[PDB]
Structure formats: structure tokens, C-alpha cells
Amino acid sequence: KKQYKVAAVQAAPAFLDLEAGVAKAIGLIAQAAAEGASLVAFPEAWLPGYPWWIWLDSPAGGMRFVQRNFDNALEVGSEPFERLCRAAAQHKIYVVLGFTERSGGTLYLAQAIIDDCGRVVATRRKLKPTHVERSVYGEGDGSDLAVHDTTLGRLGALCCAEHIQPLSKYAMYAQHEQVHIAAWPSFSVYRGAAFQLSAQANNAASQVYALEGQCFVLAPCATVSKEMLDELIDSPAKAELLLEGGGFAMIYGPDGAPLCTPLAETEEGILYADIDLGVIGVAKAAYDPVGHYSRPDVLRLLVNREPMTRVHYVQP
Amino acid sequence: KKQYKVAAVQAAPAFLDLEAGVAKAIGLIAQAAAEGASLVAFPEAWLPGYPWWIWLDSPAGGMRFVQRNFDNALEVGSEPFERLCRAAAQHKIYVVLGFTERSGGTLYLAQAIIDDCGRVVATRRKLKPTHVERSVYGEGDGSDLAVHDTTLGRLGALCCAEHIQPLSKYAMYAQHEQVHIAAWPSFSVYRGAAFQLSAQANNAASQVYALEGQCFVLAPCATVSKEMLDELIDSPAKAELLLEGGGFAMIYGPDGAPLCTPLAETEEGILYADIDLGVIGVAKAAYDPVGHYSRPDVLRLLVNREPMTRVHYVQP
Amino acid sequence: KKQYKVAAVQAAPAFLDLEAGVAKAIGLIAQAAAEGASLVAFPEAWLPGYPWWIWLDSPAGGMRFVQRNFDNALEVGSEPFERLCRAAAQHKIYVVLGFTERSGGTLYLAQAIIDDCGRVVATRRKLKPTHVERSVYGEGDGSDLAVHDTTLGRLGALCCAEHIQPLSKYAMYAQHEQVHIAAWPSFSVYRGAAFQLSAQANNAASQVYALEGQCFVLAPCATVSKEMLDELIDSPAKAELLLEGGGFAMIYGPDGAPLCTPLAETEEGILYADIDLGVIGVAKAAYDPVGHYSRPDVLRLLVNREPMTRVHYVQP
Amino acid sequence: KKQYKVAAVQAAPAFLDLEAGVAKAIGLIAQAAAEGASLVAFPEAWLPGYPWWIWLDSPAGGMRFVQRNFDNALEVGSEPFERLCRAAAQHKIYVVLGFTERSGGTLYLAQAIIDDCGRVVATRRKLKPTHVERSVYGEGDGSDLAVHDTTLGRLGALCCAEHIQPLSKYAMYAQHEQVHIAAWPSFSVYRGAAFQLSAQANNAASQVYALEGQCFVLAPCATVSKEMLDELIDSPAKAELLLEGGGFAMIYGPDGAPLCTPLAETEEGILYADIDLGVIGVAKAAYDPVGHYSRPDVLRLLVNREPMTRVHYVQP
Amino acid sequence: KKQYKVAAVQAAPAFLDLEAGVAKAIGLIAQAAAEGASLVAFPEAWLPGYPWWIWLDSPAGGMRFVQRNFDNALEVGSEPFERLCRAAAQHKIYVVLGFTERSGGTLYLAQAIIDDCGRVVATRRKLKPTHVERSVYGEGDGSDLAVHDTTLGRLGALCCAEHIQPLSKYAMYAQHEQVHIAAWPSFSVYRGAAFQLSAQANNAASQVYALEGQCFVLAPCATVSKEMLDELIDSPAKAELLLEGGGFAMIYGPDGAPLCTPLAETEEGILYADIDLGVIGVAKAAYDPVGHYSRPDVLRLLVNREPMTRVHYVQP
Amino acid sequence: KKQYKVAAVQAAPAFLDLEAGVAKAIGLIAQAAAEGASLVAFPEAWLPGYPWWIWLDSPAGGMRFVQRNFDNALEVGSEPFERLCRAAAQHKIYVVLGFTERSGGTLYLAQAIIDDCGRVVATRRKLKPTHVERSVYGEGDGSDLAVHDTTLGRLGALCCAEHIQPLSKYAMYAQHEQVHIAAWPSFSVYRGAAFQLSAQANNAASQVYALEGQCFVLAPCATVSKEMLDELIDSPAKAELLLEGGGFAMIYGPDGAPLCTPLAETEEGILYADIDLGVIGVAKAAYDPVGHYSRPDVLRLLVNREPMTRVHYVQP
């Protein structure tokens, strides 16, 4: 399909209840196809919602959320995952979820591209979580540096810090990507105290990904809502550590131009844009980091593509 | 079922009489269920009793017990075993036996998990007997490194020195275990003369198994009795080598904390603890040796799960 | 040399001053050598001090310590490092440091074994920081699971949560290690409230390493102090999260028995024990997880010993 | 029945008459049962007699015995076999015959275990005749390596140099055999001139079968007699080749100890031993080639148990 | 070389001293080489001495010998091994040692064939120690079932209860072995009271190995002596369990016939026999378990020869 | 090559001297090539000679030849075999040797077809020795029923009473054989006293192979010389059991007609025949056992072509 509409979600998660998260994702999946989108993309960790206590508290102050986050993690192929999987067929739309996965006992910061036929194209995990997220989540492999053939073309995804990581994004450029989902949390954490968590920094990370890879970058970004702070702030010394709003979702074209009509910082919504894969031919006239711009006489990528495992079982 | 009470036996075996052992086991299986335990765990070798002569004399001094150990061995699916299988249905309690098995004429140091529907989930043999237990018992294999799905969750068992073998417990962690039966004998042997047989060594081995796996360790433990010393002690030179008591049964949470009430070293009883498979999520926030707290780029286990057979029959 | 005295330090670091930390290190290198110990072992991150703010606050509360921890991090072959190296040579004693390494923009949770003639036997990075330590530290490789031939036998080191890692300690056991430094931070963080961080959990893990490995384990342990808390606590919401004391250094024999005479929890000092590498043959008559207590037909370790570089320059 | 008397025959055959052979076998079956033996075992080829001309003559000097050996071969389920089958029932004794079977054109060196109720437990052909016996007999099958449950326990049979075949007797041990009939010819052939045909060699091969298998080896044996030599020695160049006597019948316990009272080399009789199947558990403490003493990770037996038909009939 | 003299040692070890034991070996190597023997075979565990305390007491009574046995166990390729290695070259004799090997933390019951030119043809560990020997030793693997071409024909070794293991000796026969070393410890343990440990059981096991295999079996055998019992008996309850003497060394032809002139039970000596590898063609007329007497359509051996490492180090 | 001369040896072996026998084979190989024969065929067992003592003596009278048969058995790819292999090249003739193979411990009644290029097409063991030959030799298997493409067409070999085995020669016909080597021993044994060993019986069996198969049958035949009898006769009671001569070599057409010039019985020589593989199409007009004259709706052969091994080695 050579041209289509795409949706980036700018919405507050149903923070630490999986089922209300799933029900709101179903309503946004429906709403994206009702406005005519062929793809919808969700924010980082959005089922059951991003683990905000890690930025607000010591590990001890997090412990009231740890059991809840683990008991509300979305396992791939669970009944709350099939509710999202069928909803992608029931609305004939590609869904890029962002979620907390669990496997046995470890949480992973995960994403899943779901087909028009309401089945996984591929699930995914973040290779390296960001510094305090490493206390919640485990790690992905080079098998999570994957760009897939879909009816929408060469479709791939990464989340927050994986846009900062140069070899991690070059591994995605190496697969001749056309459309990208850059999943982000809310940029209301540490407002004006630490620039690396700011919308200014992380919209530049996404804009530069669109310009370096020459692909359309959906940048869905969560928002922190009024009632979510009443669960999550216990004192006035934590109030300026996480604000209401933080929604700075964006969509960028293959030359770093923003394609989205704006939303306010506190505004829940979905951004929509028009995607023509033939514009990538013009955008690649300037730059192509794995074609005409590359010097394989100077720099190459060495990449372990294989999925890793803790145990090998001997077969007779 | 995620919240339930569990029982660890601290009881003396009816030493070297299987019909008295099975009768006492069915009494303790009833007594655990009468106190509302959904699982009961028994000590290592408890039917017909742990072979204490190997710690007390030469093979020539042990010969008065070798036909008695063999003739009171508990063959799996023999009528004395089906009496214990029916007792798990008759009281709607998971039974985790520890016993001497026999097959042909090799004895094995064995265990069996039995459903509350009164059927085996798995019988199971120790992979390697401890240095002088090798003079009595044969080896298991990788088919005995199994964690089983049960109504009570991912349930597994190992016995004594298998808690001191790191690859053998990595194989159990790789199966995402939730509750564990760490079966032990009476720690009254070689008191002060050898620390590897002590309460303090093997309670640390059970506490660390819980802390490493993030699973609830039931550690049932036998105890030695006056009328068992009358069978098993003949002289003051042997009387220093094995004391009355040695009952140090324990139960541990997935954070490593002891959940049990105390029992005196000489006291027969059953320990009880309230399990919640929901707590495993909090324990796994700190460590998970097969998940976030692992290095599959640096370390992996190879395991041969397949049951070994001495003879293969060609089938036409 | 098969028989010798050994030291485990129990001391508060000169918290976030490397030049006071090194002066105090050299003062304890002297106190150990003055008591006649051939080996002195230091706690985890003891130069310049363990990053306790990770346990007491959010990253935004931690920010005031981050630049100071980086500036007081100890680089390998730095002038403060050569000072420690010369102090081992000056006193004819093996020194096992625990320090924050700095190497590029990344800190590592490191250790160094210094020879009695003052050179590194090894400089060594923790393979995986514990869940919130990952917010401060990078990772080692299988280059850092290494045991060394020395004047003191086969000598090795790991720290805190690396004893809660069955493959990571089997990788050490497979190298036929005789003496081990199990370096720990203070055990006064989250007293009662998180058992995994307690003395009972981590004295068990150190004792079970001595008992699984049949190697003498020196477990040096930090302590927290009045004038360290006066910089690190500011409110009752932090006050019970890290108590004064927390010193539970121990020394264990290859059968797991505690060889150290006690100290108070609040007390600084050096623990000592008389070591005899002949006694390993007695303990290894019972268990040897890489010898007679091992089943390579069923279980093996796959291990990658190669150090991991980020760039591979094309050699001309 | 776990404790019982058993009988090994030491008797000269009624050489080359099947009718006097069956009359003498019934005379011995009666004499064994009158003594309270629950089993009697007969020598190799005892009906109608072992083919001694193969050891004394060329095939041309043998011709006068071939038609007689063929005429007096025992057809299984024929009238003279039924005459023995009835004599087992009549006396309530297990009979282990050793005979020349005939089937169609071909002779087999054969055995039959006959029940207390006088019916065949099994009829059994030697897998490989020894040396010049291959000029008389055909081969058996993997169906002839059979150990049977009986009122007497796990009962099996092999004849002469099948106790010299290590895989063949591993196939018998793998069935957890408890009582064994090692049927032999008589050890008066080539006295001093060949040791492999001797009493010392083949009594050791039987004694080692017991010691290896941990089972009671009844070793019945023929004896040569004056009236047999007067049919079979015709010249001086044979007078030293086959002597009178050669009866070295034995019975061995599962520890290898001889249980029989000594007969003379040249005396007819029946050896009696008091068997106790409980004793096999003491013998299996030390050795068990198929259990605790095996290594099925290093060695296995592949066995084809299917009997070898020469012709297959297509069925519509 | 096809005709040669061979020597089987019958001597007491210098019990629990490797330096006195290697001197006594270097003397008996020289004494055999002076008589014209081209091969000398030594007993089982003869350096530093077979571990008789396992047969005489509990583990707790054995603890006084465990460090002495570990500290006098012979590392392969260490100076006291190279002393024996040089003594083989120095006298132009093949030496088949039997010794307690120590490799890392574990003892092994071991044998080594040293060449005429003073270098190892093989070094070799027992596949499975006998039932209470397992309280001292680890297991070998399939690389210890090896037969070697030499100046002396196809040469091989097994020790004591490996002659009792039908697949373990079919693995040897399958390699077409011509000369065998059957190393034994002294047969004075449990005189009368356990036949499995007796001279009669194990002289028959060696005879039957020679008779089954058609190879010359040298069966050297230790002896116990007054000076060994003074260290090892403290009382009459042990005094009756291990007598002085037990030397029942033998040498057998490929027909099973004893080639040795007898010694007395307590006598030290060396047995000598004229070996002729041409005679194996005559003895293989009767029997050949891997040739004309085999049935590979009914029975085959599966064997895993690969050496069993506990760790696999990943190659770059 | 469709037309050529062929040679069948009628000659006495150099009885029991392999070096003298290979000199005589190389002489006869040259004498056939000088006559322009493109193939030469040798009798059964002809290197070193047929084991005639088995038809003349008991095993005890045969003992003087067993070592002399075994030590003069021809190993394939040993030097005296290479000597015959080079003689096939040196003269540009196909050589079909018949010999006693030795492989390990066992003799085989064997054949080897060698190219004009002086290399083995195949070496080949008899599937079943004839009744007393089974006291000398082992069995081949289905890999020994092969027919080979050569320069000379579909070439195959069997020996003596394998022409008396209907399935064994159907297995050859099924491969569309064109020239056959039917190797025999001498026909001077049991003259008049056993017709199965006669010239008439086995000339008929050779003639019927040609008639049944529609292939040219070279029947080379040994003959018995005076100086062979002088070693092999001693008593007068053998003087008529094996006579001088017994050379009844023949060569037969695919219609069964004799192509050879008649040698006398007692005469050494080489028979020569003009072979034309075109004539086979006229003989196959009448009969074809595997083609137009077969009924594969009524009758089929099942055949296991695969070579039999006693031991299988597990490869990692």
C-alpha cells in the first residue's frame, strides 16, 4: 500500500490496571480507524502505563507499585493481549503497542506490531533500559533491532533512549526502513531540572532519527493526567518532580519536517498525518547512511542478530 | 490457586518398616490437610527412613540394614505407594514424598509430587547421592531436574546436596519455579565434628536457594528418636556420631525470609506458612537469575533433560 | 604458601573523598600486615564509598552526589591507584580492593587483586549491578569471572549479588579456586523492610559460596557511620532507610564454618583467620561441584571469557 | 514364592536315544521334586545327548551319528516333549530342559523352561553355537535372550559359551534376572590340551555370571560314561580326547559363592541349593551392572528382540 | 614385538606416602626390567596406597586419612609422576601404574601406561568407583575405555570391578585388545564374610576377562602388611575386617589358563610370564565376542568416547 | 568393454605360506595377462589355501594349522595385499582374488575384485561359511552381496555353497549381473562318500547359476598337490578322505553352456574363454528371474544391504 494515513497516540494510560489500559487502547484503535488511519502507534510502556515511581522515590517508596506493575504486566499471547490483537482485525488497522511485558519473573519494556489480520508481525523488547528503568526491566537482543515487511512497507520500532544510541539506530537504517515508531513516555518528569528527559531533547532525538534514517517517524508520547498524580505524589517535595501533561507527541517526515497538527501539553488526543512512501526517494537524495553516504572502507556495523537464551537443551 | 497454606513435616521416620512409614505418612498427610495446608512436603528418604548406618560404620557394620533398606524400599506404583496416592485424594492435598525407590535392585534417593486429585505429577530421583550415600543409591538424570505446572503454580523438588550444586539449581530457576520442596535428613549427624552436615550449613543452603530462585522453599527435615537410636547405636564410639533430634525444618519466602515458627531440635511436628505467589513479583524486582539479573552473552547452561536407559530395543 | 593469616576489613569509607579513602585504605593495608596477615580484603565500592543515595532517593535527589561520585571514582593506574599498589609492595601483603572504577563516561563496580610485590594480579568489574545499582554502574564481562594463581593459591573475587548467581559462581568453581573475596556493602539499608539486602540473606550467600565452592571466603563488609549519615540523611522519610552500623563482615572455611571472631555491627576493625589450603581436601571429600559432585552428561556451563570492546579498529 | 530349594542335574544322558532320554529325565525330575526342589535344571543338549563326535572325528567320521542325532532331536510340542511337560505338572517342579531341538530341516541347541503347572514358560534356542557346534546347529534370535516372571521370580537361561558373550549376558541383566540356568556339556573333552573347554574355565564363566548379574546361577552339567564312550571312542587316537566324567555341575549365589556340596567329576547325582531371592538385595549393594553401577551416558546396548522368520506371508 | 616377558607386581604400597611409594615403584620397575620383562603392571591405587579406611570405619572415623590421601594423591605430569616416567625410559620397560590421581579438587582411581621411551601412552580414570570407593573418588568417562597400539601390541587397562561390567569390557574387546592390565587392590578385606571382595571372585573375573577377550591378562594385586595395619587398625572390631596379605596376583593366557607360578598370600614378589601374541589366533578359534562369535543383527554396543568437560569456553 | 577373454585359475595354493602364495598369484596374474585375458579369477581361500584339516581332523587334530592359518591370513590393505593390487596394474588385468581375510580377531572366507588401474572395486566376505567352515570363519553381511559396474560390465562374486542359496543369488540377479566369479575349493574331498562336496554337484550349481542368472560364470577351482597332502595326511584313515587333484574349474555362458577347454582333474592350468556381453540378450530371451520371468505380485526379496558393526560411536 503506497500511500496511507497514520496515527500517533497522545493519551494518558489507565495507570496500574491492565484491563482499563486494554479497554482504552481498544477505544483508541477504533478511533484511529474511524478517522481512517492504516497504522496506530502507542506510547512507551503504555499497558499498564510507564513506571513513574522510579523517578519520584527510592526503591523502598516504589515497593507499593512493584507488585501492581508485575501483576498488571501484559504477557504476549495472554487474554488481555488477544483483546488488543483481535481489536486490530476488528478495525483493519496496524497496531504498534507499547507495554510492560513479563516472562516468568522479569519485566521487559516491550512493543508489538500487530497486522491488519490481527496477529503479531513481531513482538519486541528494549535492548538497554534507561538508567533507573534498569531497576524495573531486563534487556532485549539484536533480534529486537528488526524492521519488518508489512502492507505499509518496511515498518520498525524503538523506544526513548534507543534513538540516542547510534549503533542501535544504524542497525535499523541497515534494513532500509520506511516507517518508524519512536515510543516515548510523558516529558513532564523533572521539568527544567534535567534536560535529557525534556521534550526539547527527545523531539530532537526523533526529528534527527527521521532525518538520519529517511523514514516517517511516529513519536507517540504519553501524558500524565490529573487523577494519576493523586496515586503517585505523596508530598509537596515530589510535586515538581512530575507535572500534569508532558504530552509532546509528534510525527516527522523522512527529511525531519513535522507532519502533525499540534496538541497542547495536557491535551489527550491522536495526531494524524498523510504518508507517501514515494517521498522517501526525494528525502534520500540528500542523505543515505547505508547507501551513497556510507564509507564501508572506513566504518562497518558488526551485529549479533540472534535471539539469546539462558539455557540450551540437548536434542537426541 | 495463588494464596494457600503449605506444610513442611518435621517428623521421625518409622525407621526401616515401610508399612509403619506409610501409616505414619497418611497420618501426617491427614494432619496437614486438617490444618488447611494445600501442600505437604516430607523429609529426604523418609520412607522407610534415611540410611544412617553409612554415617556410623564400615560397609560390614551396615550389612545388618542393607536387606532391610532394600525390602522396605518404596517402588513407584507398588501398593504401599498407591496407599499414599489414595491418601492425597482422600485429603485433597498435594503430597511431596521423599523416599527410597527400588528398581530391579538399584535403590534410588527419590521424591514424588502427587496431585490433590491423587495422581503423580512426577516421581523424581536425586541426580547425585552425597559421598557415602553413593554406597546405597544410584543416580537420577536431567529428567529429574523438572519443575511441574500444578494447581499450586510452577512446583519443583530437589533434595539435600542438590541445593549445593549450582548448575542443578540453575536448571530449576530456568523453569520459572514458584514453590520448591528442598527435602533434608536429620542434622544430628557428626555434630560439631563436620559442618557440611549441620543445621547452619544446610539451612543456609535452603535460605540461599530461596533467595537465588525467588521461590518459596519448603525445607522439611527428618528427626532421630530414642527408639531409632536403640536400633542404630550399639556402642559409645557410635553414640557421639548421631544424636537424638536434628529436626531443623524451615520454610522461606522468595525474598529469603524464614516464614516458619520455630520447632525444637528434638520436637516432632509440621510447620505451616501462608504462601502468596503474588509476593514473587516483589522478590524478583531485586534479583532474577534467568531474566534481568543474567548475562546470556557471558554464561549459559547446557542441559540434557532426556531420561537415560541402559538398553534400547529396536522396533520393527 | 599453603598456610597464612588473612584479613577482612570492616570499615566505613571516607565517603566521597578519594584522598581520604586511599589514606584510610593504606592505613588498613598497614594494620593487616602489622597483625601478620598475608592478604587484606576490602568492602564493595569502598573507594570512594558505595552510592547509598540510589537507596535513599530518586535520581533528582541523588544529583548532588553524582558529580562527586564521578570525580572521586578511582581510575586504574591513576596516582591514587599506584599509591595503593605501592602500599601492598611496601608491606608484602596481597590487597583486594573494592572501588568505583571510571573508564570513559561510565563508572564500574570494580575490584583489584594486588600482588605482594605491588602489581595488579587482576582489575575486575561486576558482571551485573544489582537492580538500582544499574542506575550508577556499567557491566563487566566473562573476562571478570577469573581466578588467578598467586603466592596464596588459586585466588578469586566477586561482589554482593554475584553470589546470588548460580552460573556466575560455577564459572569460578570450574577454575578450582582455593580462596575467595566476597566483597559486600553495609547491611543497614532497609533494615527489616527488605530481607534480600539484610545481613542474614548475604551472610548465608557468602557461607553457601564457601560450602558450594570448598574455598575459604573472606567477606569484607562496609559500615555506615554517624558523619556519613549527616551528609546522606535529611528527613525521617530517609532516617530508617539506612541505619548507623551495618558491619557484618565474616570469614568462612571450605566446609562453610565461620572462622572469624565476631565484631559489633557498629564497630570498625579488621577480622582475621588462620588459613590452611590443606583443609580444602577434607571439605572436597564431601562436595565438589566441578568434580565428583558433578554430572557433565546432564549439565554443563557455556562461558564466554573474551572482553567486550565497543569498537574493533581494522588492523593494517 | 521367594525362598525355595533348587536342583542342578549332574547326569550322563541316555546318549542318542530320545525315548530312554525322556525316561531318564522324568526319573531325575521325580528325584529332584521328591527332595522338595521347586526347580530342576538339565545340562546342555541332554536330550538326546551332546554331539561329542564333532570333537572326536572329521565330518566323515561323524556321519554314523548325524541321522541318529536328527531322528532323536526333540521336536517342541511333540509327544516326547509333552511327556516331560506332563512330568513337570505331575511333580509340581519347574523344569529347565536342555535339548537338541529339531525344527523342519535344522537342529538347534535349545532349552525350555516348563512351569509348575507343566506348560512352557518359554522354549529357547542358543544365539550362536560354539566353534564346531556350528556344524550341527543353527542360530537363535534376540527372542532367545528372554527372562520370565514365574512363581520363582525373574527366571532365565543361557547355555555354555553364551556366559562368555558380554552383550548377550548384559541383555539378561537388563531384565533384572534373579535366577539363572547356565546349562553346560561336560568338561572331559581335550583334558589339558584345551583350557577353554575345561572345568576351571567354564565354572569361572558361570561364577562370574552370578557375580556380575547378582542372580542365582544353577550350572547343571552332563557327565560322560563308559557305555557312552563304547559308542563314541573306537581307536587309541581318541582315548585321551574324551575321558569318562566331566561332571562339574555347580550352583552359585548372587555374590558368586558356590552353594553346592561337591560331587565327584565322574559321579552321577543332583546338586541341591536353598535359594533366597531376598539375598539378591545384599549382592546388589556392591554391584549392579544395569543400575547404580552402570553408566548409560557412556555405554548402552542396542538389542533387536524380534524373532527372525525366513518368509513373510502377505495377508489380504 | 610379538614374544616378550611380562611382570605383574605383588607388593604392599608405601601406604600414604607418595615419596616412599614412588621410590618403591621405581625399585619394582627396575627389578622387573632386570628379569627381562618388557611390561610391568602395578596394583590399583598403589600410589600412595588404596583407601582401606572406607572398608573399616564410618566417614567420621576416616577423616584422619582424608587430608593424607589428598596430599599424597599423584597429579599426572607433576615431578613424582615424571620420576616414574623417567624410570620407565631408564630401564626400557612399559609401566602400567595404578594410583590415586588428584585433578583439581577431586580424586580419581587412575591408571597410566608409560611407554618404553618414558612418556604417557595413556592416563586413564575408572569409569565408576565401586560402591564405597565412591566416597573417595570421582567417575572417569568413555575416553577411559581405550586400547593402544604399542611396541607390545594392542595394550589396555581397566581396574577391579570394571571386569564385572559387561558393556565396559565389550568396549575393550571391540578395540581388538591383545594384552590387558587388570589392576586389583589386595583381597584381604572381609575374609569369608563378603565373597564379592574375595580372591576367588576376582581371580575368576580376571580369568573370565582373559577367556572372553582372548587377550593376556596381567592381574597385579596389592598386599596388606604389618606396618600398614599398625596405622589402619586401632581395635579388634576392625582387626577382623582387614587381614594381612590378600596378595592374589595372577597372569592369564588368551585361553584363560594361568601362566604365573604361584606366590603365597602374604608374600611380596613379581610374577613373570612368557607372552606370545601369536597364541591369540589359536584362542580366537573358539571364541571372539566382536568377530565370528558375535551377532550384530541381535546385539550392538552404543558408546560415547568423548571426554567430559564441565565447562565449554566459547572460542573467539 | 563388451568383448574380451577371461581366465579361471585351476591351481594348487602355496598351502599355508602367504609369501609363497602371493608369489604364485602374481605369476598366474601375469600368465593370464600374457594370454590377453581382461580378467583372472582365483579359487576360494587360495591365499594362503583352503583349511582342509577341518574335513580330515577333529579340532584337536587341526590345532597344528590354526596358528599357521591365522598368521598367513591376508589382511586387506596390508603389504602382501598391496603386492597383489600392484600386480593387477602392472599387467592391466582385473584380478578376482579368493582368500582368508583376517580382520581383528576373526578370519573370513573372502574375495576381492581389483581394477585394471590396480585398486579394489570391492573386497567381500562370504555371508555364511559351509557347515564345518564355520569352525574357521566368521560371517559377512548384505554389503557382501554387491554387483559392481566395471570396464567389463556388471561384475559380481560369490563362493562355493553361496550358489546353493536361492535368496543370496536372487540378491545378485536383482543387480543385473553380466559376469560372475563363482570361486570354489578342490573337489577331491570325500570322493564317493559325500556327493554335496563333489565335482558333479558343484559344477551343476555353477552351471545353474549361469542358466538362472544369464551371466558368464567363471568357476575357478583349487586342486590338491602331493606336497599339500604331505602336510595334511599322516594316518592312512585320511588317505582316501582327500585325494590328489580335484581341479574342476569351468567357465559357463549366460545360456549355461561350458565355454572352457577341459583340463584334467589332477592338472594345474588356466582355463580361457571368449566373453561377449552381447550374447546375454539372447540368453535373456528365454529366462530373466528379475524381469519378464519374475512375478513381483507373488514373490519379492527383502534385503538389508547395510554393513554390520558390533559397536557404534556417538559423535558430538
The CATH topology of chain A is what?
Answer: Nitrilase/N-carbamoyl-D-aminoacid amidohydrolase
Based on Cα principal axes, name the global outline of chain A.
globular
Task: Please provide the ordered H/E string of secondary-structure elements of chain A.
Answer: EHEHHHEEEEEHEHEHEEHE
CATH superfamily of chain A: Carbon-nitrogen hydrolase
How many domains make up the coordinates of chain A?
Answer: 1
Please report which band the strand proportion of chain A falls in: under 5%, 5-15%, 15-25%, 25-35%, 35-45% or over 45%.
Answer: 15-25%
Straight-line distance between termini of chain A: 46 Å
Protein structure class of chain A: alpha/beta
Lateral arrangement of strands in the main beta sheet of chain A: 5-4-3-2-1-11
For the biggest sheet of chain A, the summary is:
6 strands, mixed
Largest interface: B-C, 51 and 52 residues
How much helix is in the residues of chain A?
Answer: 10-25%
CATH architecture annotation name of chain A: 4-Layer Sandwich
What's the Cα radius of gyration of chain A?
Answer: 19 Å
Q: Give me the oligomer status.
A: part of a larger assembly
Assigned CATH class of chain A: Alpha Beta
The strand count of chain A comes to 12
Number of continuous helical runs of chain A: 8
Q: Overview of this structure, please?
A:
It is classed as hydrolase. Keywords: bacterial nitrilase, arylacetonitrilase, hydrolase. Cryo-EM structure of the nitrilase from Pseudomonas fluorescens EBC191 at 3.3 Angstroms. The structure is cut from a larger assembly and holds six copies of chain A (316 residues). Chain A has 316 residues and is α/β, with parallel strands linked by helices. Chain A has one domain (3-286): Nitrilase/N-carbamoyl-D-aminoacid amidohydrolase. Chain A is 24% helix and 22% strand. Chain A has eight helices and twelve strands. Chain A has a six-stranded mixed beta sheet with strand order 5-4-3-2-1-11. A five-stranded mixed beta sheet of chain A has the order 6-7-8-9-10, with helices on one face. In chain A, helix 5 (166-173) links the parallel strand 7 (153-159) and strand 8 (179-183). In chain A, helix 1 (18-34) packs parallel to helix 4. The longest helix of chain A is centred in the first third of the chain and has 17 residues, at 18-34. The first copy, chain A, is globular and about 55 Å long. The termini of chain A are far apart. Chains in contact: A-B, A-C, B-C, B-D, B-E, C-E, D-E, D-F, E-F. The interface between D and E is large, with 52 and 51 residues.
